[PDB]
Design a protein around this ligand. Structure first.
Ligand SMILES: N[C@@H](CCC(=O)O)C(=O)O
Lengths: 256, 64, 61
């Protein structure tokens, strides 16, 4: 039984190799999650095929239809057997899918174009626009936040016109870059610090993280793979591999 | 004598009199503390959901 | 009772500390700064982490 892996093209987790044209299957990709998939598949003894989530999303539940989209949806509806991606362990998702223990720690952060020093600063002005990724956990964090500043930020974002939300991380990053400092982007510390170390070296993470969460390998509820992958994650973290892959893709490749 | 301990306890002691200790360098690894139950316990599922709900609401950060 | 976190005794194969109290059924749940590790997860269940940490160094100023 070849395992169908659902993932997402998100740097530096999954990216197409420079020479993808002459490559086939799992060989066309590279990144933190590509090495991670190879590793857990090695420890769990299974063959697999990497597939990019059809709709390009992480996963959220439509309030009207109640249908899950993204990688979560592909797992929920049996289109994929496991999601190996920077997928955030959350309460709503944990209700419909299984997550292994975190393979990476992180928190929501702010990305500015090289006057804002923190979340509080964004919530006190209207000159600089700010938003998050659509269909992800960061947008949900602000939707379900009672903390005064975060509640206040969501009220501004929710009603924002034009929309401050973006389809992909790449879109948020590009928007910050071309906005002459008039747009700040709220995204996970992991992705923020990666971009911070990439040309044109014109962005920067400001302030501390807004929370402490983690990414987990996800499988459909009651999956035979669940148990084995969870233990594999723990083994890899303890062997020092996760730290090794983290430095490999984030800083040995840093160009700033 | 230097002591190797988890960052959480180190940061706690760093804020206690006689204020003579300090945490140095980066963390050697990354891991987490979890609420534990016996294998196949009835409580497992609900306590995991509670931990996630409480972290998302800001309680865990508030408590630290 | 033994004031420990939890380790398996290589000679005796017995689990001590909080882990042992859970393994042998003396307690129903352990709510402590108990690290999620592979050897422990093989014998007990852990929720997702309630606190993130890492080993560090404590020196006298
Ligand atoms: N990691 C997030 C996507 C990125 C974000 O929302 O900032 C998720 O799993 O939904």
């Amino acid at each position: 039984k070849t395992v169908v892996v659902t993932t997402i093209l998100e740097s530096p987790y999954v990216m197409m190799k420079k020479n993808h044209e002459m490559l086939e299957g799992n060989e066309r990709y590279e990144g933190y999650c590509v090495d991670l998939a190879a590793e857990i598949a090695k420890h769990c003894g299974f063959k697999y095929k990497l597939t990019i989530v059809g709709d390009g999303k992480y996963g959220a539940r439509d309030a009207d239809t109640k249908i899950w989209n993204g990688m979560v949806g592909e797992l929920v509806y049996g289109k994929a057997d496991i999601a190996i991606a920077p997928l955030t362990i959350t309460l709503v998702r944990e209700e419909v899918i299984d997550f292994s223990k975190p393979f990476m720690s992180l928190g929501i952060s702010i990305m500015i174009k090289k006057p804002i020093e923190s979340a509080e600063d964004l919530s006190k002005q209207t000159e600089i626009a700010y938003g998050t990724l659509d269909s992800g956990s960061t947008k949900e964090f602000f939707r379900r936040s009672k903390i005064a500043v975060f509640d206040k930020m969501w009220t501004y974002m929710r009603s924002a016109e034009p929309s401050v939300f973006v389809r992909t991380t790449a879109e948020g990053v590009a928007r910050v870059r071309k906005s002459k400092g008039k747009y700040a982007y709220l995204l996970e510390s992991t992705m923020n610090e990666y971009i911070e170390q990439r040309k044109p070296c014109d962005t920067m993470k400001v302030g501390g993280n807004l929370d402490s969460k983690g990414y987990g390998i996800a499988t459909p509820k009651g999956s035979s793979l669940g148990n084995p992958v969870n233990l594999a994650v723990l083994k890899l973290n303890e062997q020092g591999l996760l730290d090794k892959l983290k430095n490999k893709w984030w800083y040995d490749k840093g160009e700033c």
